[PDB]
Amino acid sequence: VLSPADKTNVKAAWGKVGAHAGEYGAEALERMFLSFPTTKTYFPHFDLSHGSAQVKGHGKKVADALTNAVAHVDDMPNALSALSDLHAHKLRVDPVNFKLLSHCLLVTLAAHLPAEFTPAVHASLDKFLASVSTVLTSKYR
Amino acid sequence: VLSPADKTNVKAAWGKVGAHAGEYGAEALERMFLSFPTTKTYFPHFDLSHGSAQVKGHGKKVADALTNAVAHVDDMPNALSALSDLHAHKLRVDPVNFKLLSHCLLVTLAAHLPAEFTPAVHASLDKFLASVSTVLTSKYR
Amino acid sequence: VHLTPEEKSAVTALWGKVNVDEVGGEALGRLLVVYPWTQRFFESFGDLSTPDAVMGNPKVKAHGKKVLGAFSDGLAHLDNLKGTFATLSELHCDKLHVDPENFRLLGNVLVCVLAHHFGKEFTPPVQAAYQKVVAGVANALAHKYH
Amino acid sequence: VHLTPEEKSAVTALWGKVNVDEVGGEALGRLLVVYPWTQRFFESFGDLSTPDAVMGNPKVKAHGKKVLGAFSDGLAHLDNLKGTFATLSELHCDKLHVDPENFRLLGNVLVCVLAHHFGKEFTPPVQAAYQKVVAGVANALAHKYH
Ligand code: HEM
Numbered sequence: 001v002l003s004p005a006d007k008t009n010v011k012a013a014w015g016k017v018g019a020h021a022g023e024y025g026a027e028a029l030e031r032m033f034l035s036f037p038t039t040k041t042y043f044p045h046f047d048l049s050h051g052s053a054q055v056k057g058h059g060k061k062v063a064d065a066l067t068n069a070v071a072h073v074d075d076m077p078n079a080l081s082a083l084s085d086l087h088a089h090k091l092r093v094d095p096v097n098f099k100l101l102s103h104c105l106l107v108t109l110a111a112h113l114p115a116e117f118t119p120a121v122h123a124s125l126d127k128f129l130a131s132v133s134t135v136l137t138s139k140y141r
Numbered sequence: 142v143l144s145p146a147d148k149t150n151v152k153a154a155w156g157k158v159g160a161h162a163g164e165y166g167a168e169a170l171e172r173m174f175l176s177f178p179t180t181k182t183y184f185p186h187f188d189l190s191h192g193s194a195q196v197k198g199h200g201k202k203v204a205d206a207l208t209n210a211v212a213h214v215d216d217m218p219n220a221l222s223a224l225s226d227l228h229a230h231k232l233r234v235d236p237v238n239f240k241l242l243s244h245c246l247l248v249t250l251a252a253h254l255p256a257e258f259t260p261a262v263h264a265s266l267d268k269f270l271a272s273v274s275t276v277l278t279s280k281y282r
Numbered sequence: 283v284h285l286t287p288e289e290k291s292a293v294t295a296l297w298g299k300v301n302v303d304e305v306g307g308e309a310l311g312r313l314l315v316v317y318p319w320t321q322r323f324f325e326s327f328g329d330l331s332t333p334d335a336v337m338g339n340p341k342v343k344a345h346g347k348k349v350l351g352a353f354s355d356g357l358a359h360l361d362n363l364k365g366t367f368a369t370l371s372e373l374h375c376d377k378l379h380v381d382p383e384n385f386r387l388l389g390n391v392l393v394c395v396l397a398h399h400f401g402k403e404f405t406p407p408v409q410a411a412y413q414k415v416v417a418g419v420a421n422a423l424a425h426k427y428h
Numbered sequence: 429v430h431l432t433p434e435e436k437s438a439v440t441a442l443w444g445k446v447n448v449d450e451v452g453g454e455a456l457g458r459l460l461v462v463y464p465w466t467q468r469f470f471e472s473f474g475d476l477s478t479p480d481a482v483m484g485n486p487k488v489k490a491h492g493k494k495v496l497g498a499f500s501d502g503l504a505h506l507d508n509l510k511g512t513f514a515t516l517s518e519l520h521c522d523k524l525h526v527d528p529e530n531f532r533l534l535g536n537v538l539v540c541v542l543a544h545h546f547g548k549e550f551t552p553p554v555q556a557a558y559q560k561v562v563a564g565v566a567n568a569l570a571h572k573y574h
């Protein structure tokens with residue numbers, strides 16, 4: 001359950017991501033494709049090379065979708081209802097990949113929020129990424 | 142989430158497990174320790190030899206909690222609340238192990254219900270063991 | 283992988299009684315029913331909308347037979363699952379883009395299907411030897427991904 | 429495992445700037461705070477109630493420094509992780525009973541703590557070299573379970 005400390009810690013670290021989310025989204029994607037290269041069978045149609053405008057443009061959508069879930073932390077199953085329908089019915093990405101993106105998102109925030117990524121913000125961020133994965137995976141069956 | 146027809150399939154199939162619930166619970170356990178031996182780091186103080194009375198008595202605690210979760214399948218977190226509290230605050234069993242017991246549970250039922258283990262009743266029972274495992278690991282953090 | 287040979291002849295005796303034409307189609311059938319997001323690689327196959335359609339769908343039964351005939355080839359090269367599957371591993375990666383976590387999911391539906399089909403004859407130690415083969419094939423077939 | 433001779437110079441050059449004693453404590457700490465069921469092994473350890481109780485405990489600190497000292501040896505032999513840790517594998521198995529799935533969870537908390545630490549130096553190809561190293565050390569340590 002996202003406790004009220006968690007929501008404050010996730011709104012505090014995400015606020016500080018800031019106008020840089022789009023950027024941090026793309027660097028997560030990139031880190032995922034190099035560290036877990038099965039995660040690349042989902043983007044066969046992409047230019048997945050460094051600095052691709054396709055990876056930077058998918059970075060911006062993943063990142064906006066997280067901004068909207070942090071903004072309605074209080075009501076995720078409803079803010080994220082079109083993307084759980086998309087995920088569950090067109091994309092049908094295997095659930096394990098949600099773990100591998102949240103880990104490469106958690107390493108991109110750590111890398112860029114030295115001062116903000118405290119043990120407790122990390123637990124808060126790892127808890128919130130696991131509820132967003134649970135909600136985008138809810139209607140798989 | 143358990144659709145009505147899932148509820149009907151779960152209840153039919155646990156319907157003829159009926160009084161062998163205990164004996165199949167001991168046998169899922171016994172397949173689990175032999176197929177996945179890492180799960181035995183959890184049962185240090187047991188005898189896990191073939192036919193141990195402690196495997197057979199813990200199969201019966203386990204199938205009876207499943208029986209109880211079948212009968213209260215429209216409100217399993219209150220029906221299982223104290224079992225979430227023991228998993229969460231004492232047993233503290235890594236979440237991937239629920240997945241390994243569900244599959245041994247499904248291989249035991251598959252093997253003892255030739256007629257009732259249909260694709261359809263196989264799909265509802267696996268949705269039903271993923272819902273009891275989500276509820277027992279709810280409160281881990 | 284290595285099976286002790288008490289494991290190896292466990293797997294091998296049982297598999298001589300299989301119907302690769304019918305466990306074929308049931309394993310690939312029940313994968314597409316129990317884990318419906320796997321239907322994304324098979325939409326070309328038709329009507330996959332209820333369980334009874336998926337199981338009645340003859341392209342599903344046909345390709346299951348083809349999945350399970352290749353499976354039987356590595357049950358004969360158990361020493362070497364990687365060189366035996368290097369080619370389909372490349373092929374599922376590069377021409378089919380199949381997430382190798384599906385190979386684990388078919389793995390475990392095939393063990394439910396062999397329990398179903400052999401009843402009590404699919405004992406805790408034959409399962410345990412067959413969980414070691416289906417991790418070996420899933421592994422062998424993930425082998426050539428990049 | 430198979431680290432290209434470029435992935436090993438990457439791992440080796442980041443690890444000779446690491447203070448072992450201090451990254452040790454921040455990784456065990458953060459294991460215990462971010463995956464709090466892992467505290468089922470550390471009852472003898474004292475105040476583990478809040479993040480800063482876990483992070484100031486000098487027992488938690490201490491054993492982090494013992495864990496990372498042995499991981500640090502693992503790094504002098506990337507070409508035989510299994511015989512360099514099969515003695516701790518056999519010990520966490522049979523005497524400590526740790527589910528080897530906790531070695532993935534600490535491995536992924538140490539990739540987060542070296543990022544946190546190195547910042548923009550911990551690049552996507554240096555993350556990818558260390559993911560293969562903490563996977564090799566987790567397999568190595570899981571090796572003698574049974
Ligand atoms: C034990 C694992 C498996 C084995 C041994 C296996 C074997 C095969 C074989 C022999 C073919 C045909 C090669 C050819 O036609 O030239 C094939 C094709 C294919 N496999 Fe797999 N496979 C396995 C698992 C999977 C999984 C689980 C998926 C997807 C969820 C998958 C998706 C496909 C698809 C999409 C095709 C092509 C269907 C088509 O041609 O229209 N396979 N596989």
Ligand code: HEM
Nearest residue numbers: 466469470491494495496498499516524526530531534565
């Ligand atoms: C890279 C992963 C790991 C390495 C290299 C490592 C290494 C060590 C070392 C060298 C010791 C002391 C053994 C001795 O006294 O001879 C130790 C003790 C222990 N480890 Fe691990 N370990 C790892 C992961 C884990 C994890 C993830 C846990 C569980 C959360 C764990 C639980 C323990 C416990 C409970 C002790 C006992 C402390 C004592 O005897 O005082 N270890 N580990």
Ligand code: HNI
Nearest residue numbers: 039042043058061062065066083091093097098101132133
């Ligand atoms: C490894 C695969 C994978 C994962 C784990 C993943 C995880 C996530 C998460 C994680 C918490 C979020 C918020 C997210 C958000 C999105 N994904 Ni994901 N996606 C993934 C692969 C995709 C793919 C593939 C698409 C299609 C992109 C395209 O444009 O074709 C996609 C599309 C989207 C879209 C855009 C669709 C549109 O056009 O309207 C959003 C938003 N996503 N994805």
Ligand code: HNI
Nearest residue numbers: 180183184199202203206207232234238239242273274277
């Ligand atoms: C592999 C480890 C493991 C798994 C996955 C697991 C999964 C499950 C599942 C999920 C479907 C159920 C319903 C279940 C039910 C129970 N477990 Ni589990 N348990 C596990 C290890 C235990 C252990 C350990 C205990 C304590 C047993 C004992 O006798 O000390 C336990 C205790 C219980 C009890 C006993 C309550 C009591 O003694 O007060 C029940 C009932 N369970 N366990």
Ligand SMILES: O=P(O)(O)O[C@H]1[C@H](OP(=O)(O)O)[C@@H](OP(=O)(O)O)[C@H](OP(=O)(O)O)[C@@H](OP(=O)(O)O)[C@H]1OP(=O)(O)O
Nearest residue numbers: 283284364421429430506507508509510511564567568571
């Ligand atoms: O196929 P596996 O059973 O996984 O074994 C092979 C390899 O030997 P083979 O390639 O000859 O089979 C080694 O296994 P061991 O003899 O050490 O047990 C080990 O490779 P390293 O020497 O590089 O450690 C590694 O096994 P694992 O990753 O399970 O530790 C794995 O090598 P590949 O994954 O490169 O095939």
